[PDB]
Amino acid sequence: HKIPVEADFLYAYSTAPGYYSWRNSKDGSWFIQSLCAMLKQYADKLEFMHILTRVNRKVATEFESFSFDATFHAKKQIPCIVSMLTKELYFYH
């Protein structure tokens, strides 16, 4: 009959609430780099939530910040998947 007006949204954040989000000057942001890499590899293999979970792991384990100021050096990042989806999402139908 009725569905919520807020249903069927997905917000895929690059970083946790309250936190900074890191970009590489030459390769681009950590999140988008990982997103595109994981979609190219798994879009035909995995459901979208599991693709974004690989993205979480890739950003979490493969990236660490560089800075000449110790305030910003050796920092980490975890993305934040926010799902109000009612169904699984496959790009290959």
Partner: protein, 120 residues
């Protein structure tokens, strides 16, 4: 990449190496991923000579890092009066706030800096 070498030379305080790199066309406004410029580094570490040569060649006096801190904020934190004077002469924003709401004047009061409170 000459920008990375310049940032590295500025941090180590190598004045001669800074000039050699600039003469080869290094960007005085080079940044790392956190938006830290050669001027930020020179101001924090008290390198008066390098600050002056950077500003002379058009380095952004009001560039702020990822925490919104300008070279004037960083100079005020350490308490280097001479650098503060030079920054203000190149049009440093006395009213500039970092992403934590503090001005260069606000930092000087926090530290209990007597001489810096009257200049600002």
């Amino acid at each position: 990449d000459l920008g990375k070498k310049l940032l590295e030379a500025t941090r180590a305080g190598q004045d001669d190496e800074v000039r050699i790199l600039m003469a080869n066309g290094a960007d005085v406004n080079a940044m790392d991923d956190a938006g830290v410029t050669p001027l930020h580094l020179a101001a924090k570490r008290g390198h008066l000579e390098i600050v002056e040569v950077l500003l002379k060649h058009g380095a952004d006096v009001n560039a702020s890092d990822s925490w919104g801190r300008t070279p004037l904020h960083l100079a005020a934190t350490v308490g280097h009066l001479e650098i503060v004077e030079v920054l203000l002469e190149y049009g440093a924003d006395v009213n500039a706030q970092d992403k934590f709401g503090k001005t260069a004047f606000d930092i000087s009061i926090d530290n209990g800096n007597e001489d810096l409170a009257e200049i600002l």
